[PDB]
Amino acid sequence: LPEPLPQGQLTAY
Amino acid sequence: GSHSMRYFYTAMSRPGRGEPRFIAVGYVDDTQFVRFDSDAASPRTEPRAPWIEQEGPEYWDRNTQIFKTNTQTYRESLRNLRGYYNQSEAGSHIIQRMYGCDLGPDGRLLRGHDQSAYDGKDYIALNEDLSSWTAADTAAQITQRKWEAARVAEQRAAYLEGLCVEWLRRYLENGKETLQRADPPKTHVTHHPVSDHEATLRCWALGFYPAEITLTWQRDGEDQTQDTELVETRPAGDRTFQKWAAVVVPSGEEQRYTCHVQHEGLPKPLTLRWEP
Amino acid sequence: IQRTPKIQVYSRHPAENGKSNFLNCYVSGFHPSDIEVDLLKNGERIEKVEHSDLSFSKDWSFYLLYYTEFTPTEKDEYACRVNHVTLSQPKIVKWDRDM
């Protein structure tokens, strides 16, 4: 299983 | 034995040829088990090993959402990195990420990994502490600060110590007949004259899993490292791997050379000679 | 900065004339990821060729396996043909059953 999405906004680079 | 899980993400911009392509592949050791490709007719997470197929719809849709959202975010990241390096909108660029967890022989977390690169060069990496970042340059420093402000490391740590280990253990159990099976190399030594006074000795390892292997030639018990020609370990396509090592030796000195083979699947380390 | 592909051409199983096998071309160590790979039979492009999913090594370089079913004979010649931004012309590596 890959890293799940965070509860908030997925942080871009 | 010991085991690891890794996801490999690749995001590639292509100005004038649509939006950046995102691909993700998942591995346990040297076995790929999933893929996602944003360029597929109908982008979705797909099974690539038999033991993952028993996972339910819930799992496949969960993966797919993760990969769909990441596809969009990496597009933003590519825009951002082009700016951090003051690059023209004309060129194609790549962000890579590789991350996952390592377990020791008793199933415990050995360590986590989460590394990223831009155009093939180290960009930012999570330190072994899973708390702090190493940034390669002043561009990566912008990401570091953003990631520090957003408490990203805590998110990565929680995954690497939690879900990553838990799911790896599940996969190792489900695929135990292959994932926890080491197949030893089948070996032989060939002999090919190169001239009247020199011959090639080639030591072969075929059909082994996992890929990790040590193949060396010795002369009179001394390693012939600089004089050995050593090809990269290569996939056979049936899950197994192949490798060879070659040395060129004076004709008549063949019996002074020994091939040594170390592999997890061997009851004992191997010592081979040419057998006329 | 760019990295040129390494290329190996070989069979899945030890080759035996008249026996069905798989012809492999493993291209690795390259960057960026765009790459063109053909398998050739007697100098002609083979039509049904599959490849692995794009992935990469710890040094960030990419690797791909291209493959197709074939039946080796003593007279038929096989080869892999590769192009990449790093190459001025396509590079051809012949299949040698001893390599």
- Domains of chain B and any CATH numbers: 1-181 (3.30.500.10), 182-272 (2.60.40.10)
Shortest CA gap A11–chain B (Å):
7
Contact B45, B70 (CB under 8 A): no
Closest by CA to C6, choosing from C62, C67, C66, C79, is C62
Domains of chain C, start order: 1-99 (2.60.40.10)
Contact B135, B155 (CB under 8 A): no
With CB atoms and an 8 Å threshold, state whether B25 touches C8: no
Contact B107, B169 (CB under 8 A): yes
Alpha helices, H only, B188-241? none
Does residue A2 belong to the interface with chain B, where contact is any CB pair within 8 Å? Answer: yes
> Which chain B residue lies closest to C29 (C-alpha atoms)?
B232
**Contact residues on chain B for A4, CB-CB shorter than 8 A:** 62, 66, 159, 163
Does residue A7 belong to the interface with chain B, where contact is any CB pair within 8 Å? Answer: no
* Residue B219 identity (one-letter amino acid): R
Handedness of CA C24, C29, C30, C31 (dihedral sign): positive
Task: Return the residue matching tokens 């109908």.
Answer: B42
- As given in the structure block, the two tokens for residue B53 are 């197929």
φ, ψ (nearest 5 deg) of residue B66:
-55, -50
Neighbours of B4 (CB within 10 A): 17
Distance between CA atoms of residues B239 and B110, nearest Å: 26
* Residue B153 identity (one-letter amino acid): A
Distance between CA atoms of residues B82 and B10, nearest Å: 16
* Residue C94 identity (one-letter amino acid): K
Distance between CA atoms of residues B228 and B220, nearest Å: 14
- As given in the structure block, the two tokens for residue B275 are 């057998």
Does residue A6 belong to the interface with chain B, where contact is any CB pair within 8 Å? Answer: yes
Distance between CA atoms of residues C5 and C63, nearest Å: 9
With CB atoms and an 8 Å threshold, state whether C32 touches B119: yes
Closest by CA to B206, choosing from C69, C64, C13, is C13
**Contact residues on chain B for A5, CB-CB shorter than 8 A:** 65-66, 69
φ, ψ (nearest 5 deg) of residue B158:
-65, -40
- Provide the β-strand partners of residue B118: B95, B121
> Which chain B residue lies closest to C27 (C-alpha atoms)?
B234
What angle (nearest 5°) sits at the alpha carbon of residue B14, between those of residues B8 and B19? 80
Method: X-ray
Does residue B92 belong to the interface with chain C, where contact is any CB pair within 8 Å? Answer: yes
Distance between CA atoms of residues B244 and B204, nearest Å: 5
Residues 6 or more apart whose Cβ sits within 8 Å of residue C37 = C25, C27, C49, C51, C64, C66, C80, C81, C82
Contact B271, B218 (CB under 8 A): no
**Contact residues on chain A for B116, CB-CB shorter than 8 A:** 13
**Contact residues on chain A for B81, CB-CB shorter than 8 A:** 13
Pairing of strands B94-103, B46-47: unpaired
DSSP letter at B88 equals -
